[PDB]
C-alpha cells in the first residue's frame, strides 16, 4: 500500500528510540539552529512593564537516529510525532506567562529529512518583561528584550 511503507519507516525509526536522551549525548554538543517570524508585535503595557509578541518559533537540529531511506526525502508528519522524539527544552528567560496555541490542534509542525535533519516549529504568544526608565516619559524610548535558551542543558 502507499501508506504502509511509510508506517513501516516510522515504526523502524521509533524502534528502540529513547526520547529522554538528546542527540549525541556524551559524545558531542547538540547544535540547535533557531529563527523567529514575528506574526504580530503585541501591545505594550506600561503598568506591568511588559509586552506581548506572537511568533512562529522555528528550531532545527541533527538527529542521526532518525535518518531513513524512503520514497520522499522529507516526511511532513503530524505534530503528534514530536512528542515521541527528543526536542529542545527551550524556554524564555524573561517570559512572564506564555501560551502555546492548540486550537484546533497543537500549532506545531515536525519535518524529518532523510539525512536526519529535523525542522520543528511552534506557534507561541510570549508575554515578556520589558523594564523601562520613565524619566523622559512620554518622550521616552525602550529596548524590550526577548531572551530564550535551554532550561536544563548547559553549554
Amino acid at each position, epitope marked *: 500500500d502507499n501508506t504502509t511503507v511509510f508506517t513501516r519507516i516510522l515504526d523502524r525509526l521509533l524502534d528502540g528510540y529513547d526520547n529522554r536522551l538528546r542527540p549525541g549525548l556524551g559524545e558531542r554538543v547538540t547544535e540547535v539552529k533557531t529563527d523567529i517570524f514575528v506574526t504580530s508585535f503585541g501591545p505594550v503595557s506600561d503598568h506591568d512593564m511588559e509586552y506581548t509578541i506572537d511568533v512562529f518559533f522555528r528550531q532545527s537540529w541533527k538527529d542521526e537516529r532518525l535518518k531513513f531511506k524512503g520514497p520522499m526525502t522529507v516526511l511532513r508528519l503530524n505534530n503528534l510525532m514530536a512528542s515521541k522524539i527528543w526536542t529542545p527544552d527551550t524556554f524564555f*528567560h*524573561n517570559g512572564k506567562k506564555s501560551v502555546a496555541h492548540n486550537m484546533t490542534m497543537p500549532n506545531k509542525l515536525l519535518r524529518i529529512t532523510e539525512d536526519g535533519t529535523l525542522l520543528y516549529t511552534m506557534r507561541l504568544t510570549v508575554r515578556a518583561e520589558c*523594564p523601562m*526608565h520613565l524619566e523622559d516619559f512620554p518622550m521616552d*524610548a*525602550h*529596548a524590550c*528584550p526577548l*531572551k530564550f535558551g535551554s532550561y536544563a542543558y548547559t553549554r
Partner: nanobody, 108 residues
C-alpha cells in the same frame, strides 16, 4: 599577564541598566569588549571572547572585567559605561554614562 579592572558607580543605581566595557587604542575607534545585563546575561566581542570575563556586583553597584592572556595589541584606554541598550548593547551611542577611562599597557 593577568589583570582585573573594576568600575564603581555613584549617584544612580544601575541595577536595571546594562554595564559595559569598551576599549580605545591610539588612532583606532572605540570598540565593544563586554557587557552584562540585569538578567546576568553576558555579551562579548569576537576579539575578546573566552579571554575577558565580565561580572557585576549589584549590591555595590559595580562592574568588573577580568583580563587574561594579554597581548601587545591589548594596550589601550579601557572605559566603563552604563546604559539602557537602545539600538545597542554594542554601539557606544547607546550608553549615556561613561567613565573617565583607565590606561592599560602590555610590554613584551
Amino acid at each position: 599577564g593577568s589583570l582585573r579592572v573594576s568600575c564603581a558607580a555613584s549617584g544612580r543605581t544601575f541595577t536595571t541598566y546594562i554595564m559595559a566595557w569598551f576599549r580605545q587604542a591610539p588612532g583606532k575607534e572605540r570598540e565593544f569588549l563586554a557587557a552584562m545585563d540585569q538578567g546576568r546575561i553576558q555579551y562579548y566581542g569576537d576579539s575578546v571572547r573566552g579571554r575577558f570575563t565580565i561580572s557585576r556586583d549589584y549590591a555595590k553597584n559595580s562592574v568588573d572585567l577580568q583580563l587574561d592572556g594579554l597581548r601587545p595589541e591589548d594596550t589601550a584606554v579601557y572605559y566603563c559605561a552604563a546604559g539602557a541598550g537602545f539600538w545597542g548593547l554594542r554601539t557606544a551611542s547607546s550608553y549615556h554614562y561613561w567613565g573617565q577611562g583607565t590606561q592599560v599597557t602590555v610590554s613584551s
